[PDB]
Protein backbone atom coordinates (compact mmCIF):
# COMPACT_ATOMS: atom_id res chain seq x y z
CA UNK A 724 0.00 0.00 0.00
CA UNK A 725 0.83 3.72 -0.05
CA UNK A 726 2.69 4.56 3.16
CA UNK A 727 2.31 8.32 2.81
CA UNK A 728 -1.49 8.04 2.38
CA UNK A 729 -1.70 5.53 5.24
CA UNK A 730 0.19 7.95 7.49
CA UNK A 731 -2.34 10.72 6.98
CA UNK A 732 -5.13 8.24 7.67
CA UNK A 733 -3.38 7.21 10.86
CA UNK A 734 -2.93 10.77 12.07
CA UNK A 735 -6.57 11.56 11.29
CA UNK A 736 -8.26 8.43 12.66
CA UNK A 737 -5.87 6.69 15.00
CA UNK A 738 -3.30 9.02 16.56
CA UNK A 739 -5.71 10.35 19.17
CA UNK A 740 -5.50 6.91 20.78
CA UNK A 741 -2.20 5.45 19.60
CA UNK A 742 1.50 6.06 19.13
CA UNK A 743 3.67 3.91 16.82
CA UNK A 744 7.31 4.66 17.76
CA UNK A 745 9.64 2.46 19.82
CA UNK A 746 9.20 3.53 23.47
CA UNK A 747 6.11 5.51 22.51
CA UNK A 748 3.51 6.10 25.15
CA UNK A 749 0.24 4.33 25.65
CA UNK A 750 -2.62 6.80 25.23
CA UNK A 751 -6.28 5.59 25.23
CA UNK A 752 -4.96 2.55 23.36
CA UNK A 753 -1.56 0.79 23.27
CA UNK A 754 1.60 1.90 21.61
CA UNK A 755 1.84 -0.26 18.43
CA UNK A 756 5.60 -0.75 18.07
CA UNK A 757 6.31 -4.39 17.21
CA UNK A 758 2.72 -5.13 16.27
CA UNK A 759 3.38 -7.35 13.26
CA UNK A 760 4.09 -11.02 13.84
CA UNK A 761 2.93 -10.76 17.46
CA UNK A 762 -0.18 -12.22 19.05
CA UNK A 763 -3.00 -9.96 20.05
CA UNK A 764 -2.81 -8.00 23.31
CA UNK A 765 0.94 -8.16 23.90
CA UNK A 766 2.14 -4.56 24.11
CA UNK A 767 4.21 -4.29 27.26
CA UNK A 768 2.57 -2.51 30.16
CA UNK A 769 -0.80 -1.88 28.54
CA UNK A 770 -3.97 -3.12 30.27
CA UNK A 771 -6.03 -4.83 27.59
CA UNK A 772 -9.52 -6.18 27.84
CA UNK A 773 -9.61 -9.96 28.30
CA UNK A 774 -11.08 -10.07 24.77
CA UNK A 775 -8.08 -8.37 23.14
CA UNK A 776 -5.74 -10.61 25.17
CA UNK A 777 -7.58 -13.80 24.30
CA UNK A 778 -8.33 -13.38 20.62
CA UNK A 779 -5.13 -15.37 20.09
CA UNK A 780 -4.33 -14.73 16.50
CA UNK A 781 -1.11 -13.27 15.11
CA UNK A 782 -1.28 -9.75 13.70
CA UNK A 783 -0.24 -9.61 10.02
CA UNK A 784 -1.62 -8.11 6.82
CA UNK A 785 -4.47 -10.57 6.60
CA UNK A 786 -5.71 -10.23 10.18
CA UNK A 787 -5.21 -6.44 10.48
CA UNK A 788 -7.12 -5.87 7.26
CA UNK A 789 -10.06 -7.87 8.63
CA UNK A 790 -9.90 -6.30 12.07
CA UNK A 791 -9.66 -2.66 10.94
CA UNK A 792 -12.76 -3.02 8.80
CA UNK A 793 -14.86 -3.64 11.92
CA UNK A 794 -12.99 -3.86 15.22
CA UNK A 795 -15.79 -4.99 17.48
CA UNK A 796 -16.90 -7.73 15.08
CA UNK A 797 -13.44 -9.22 15.13
CA UNK A 798 -12.83 -8.65 18.85
CA UNK A 799 -16.24 -8.65 20.60
CA UNK A 800 -15.87 -6.96 23.98
CA UNK A 801 -13.00 -4.74 22.86
CA UNK A 802 -12.66 -1.33 24.47
CA UNK A 803 -11.27 0.14 21.23
CA UNK A 804 -14.32 2.19 20.24
CA UNK A 805 -13.89 2.88 16.52
CA UNK A 806 -16.14 1.86 13.70
CA UNK A 807 -13.53 0.75 11.21
CA UNK A 808 -12.00 1.91 7.91
CA UNK A 809 -14.62 0.60 5.47
CA UNK A 810 -12.81 1.20 2.17
CA UNK A 811 -10.41 -1.60 1.34
CA UNK A 812 -7.87 0.66 -0.34
CA UNK A 813 -7.74 3.07 2.57
CA UNK A 814 -7.33 0.14 4.90
CA UNK A 815 -4.51 -1.35 2.81
CA UNK A 816 -2.60 1.98 2.69
CA UNK A 817 -3.06 2.28 6.46
CA UNK A 818 -1.68 -1.27 6.97
CA UNK A 819 1.27 -0.37 4.73
CA UNK A 820 2.01 2.64 6.97
CA UNK A 821 1.64 0.56 10.15
CA UNK A 822 4.05 -2.07 8.83
CA UNK A 823 6.57 0.64 8.02
CA UNK A 824 6.21 2.63 11.24
CA UNK A 825 6.15 -0.13 13.82
CA UNK A 826 9.51 -1.80 13.09
Ligand code: COH
Pocket residue numbers: 733736737739740741751752753758762763764765766770771772774775776791800801802803804805808
Ligand atom coordinates in the same frame (compact mmCIF):
# COMPACT_ATOMS: atom_id res chain seq x y z
C1 COH B 1 -11.01 6.13 20.56
C2 COH B 1 -9.88 5.25 20.62
C3 COH B 1 -9.25 4.49 19.59
C4 COH B 1 -9.23 4.71 18.26
C5 COH B 1 -9.83 5.88 17.50
C6 COH B 1 -8.45 3.68 17.64
C7 COH B 1 -8.08 3.61 16.34
C8 COH B 1 -7.22 2.66 15.82
C9 COH B 1 -6.67 2.71 14.50
C10 COH B 1 -7.25 3.58 13.52
C11 COH B 1 -7.76 3.15 12.33
C12 COH B 1 -5.72 1.77 14.39
C13 COH B 1 -4.75 1.52 13.26
C14 COH B 1 -5.75 1.04 15.65
C15 COH B 1 -5.10 -0.19 15.87
C16 COH B 1 -5.24 -0.97 16.97
N1 COH B 1 -5.98 -0.58 18.07
CO1 COH B 1 -7.00 1.12 18.32
N2 COH B 1 -8.00 2.76 18.61
C17 COH B 1 -8.49 3.26 19.80
C18 COH B 1 -8.37 2.63 21.06
C19 COH B 1 -7.78 1.37 21.23
C20 COH B 1 -7.81 0.67 22.53
C21 COH B 1 -8.40 1.26 23.82
C22 COH B 1 -7.29 -0.59 22.28
C23 COH B 1 -7.20 -1.79 23.22
C24 COH B 1 -8.55 -2.56 23.01
C25 COH B 1 -8.82 -3.63 24.08
O1 COH B 1 -7.94 -3.84 24.96
O2 COH B 1 -9.91 -4.26 23.99
C26 COH B 1 -6.91 -0.66 20.88
C27 COH B 1 -6.30 -1.73 20.23
C28 COH B 1 -5.90 -1.69 18.94
C29 COH B 1 -5.10 -2.76 18.29
C30 COH B 1 -4.79 -4.12 18.88
C31 COH B 1 -3.46 -3.97 19.63
C32 COH B 1 -2.91 -5.28 20.16
O3 COH B 1 -3.55 -6.35 19.99
O4 COH B 1 -1.82 -5.23 20.74
C33 COH B 1 -4.71 -2.30 17.11
C34 COH B 1 -3.95 -3.01 16.01
N3 COH B 1 -7.24 0.57 20.23
N4 COH B 1 -6.66 1.63 16.52
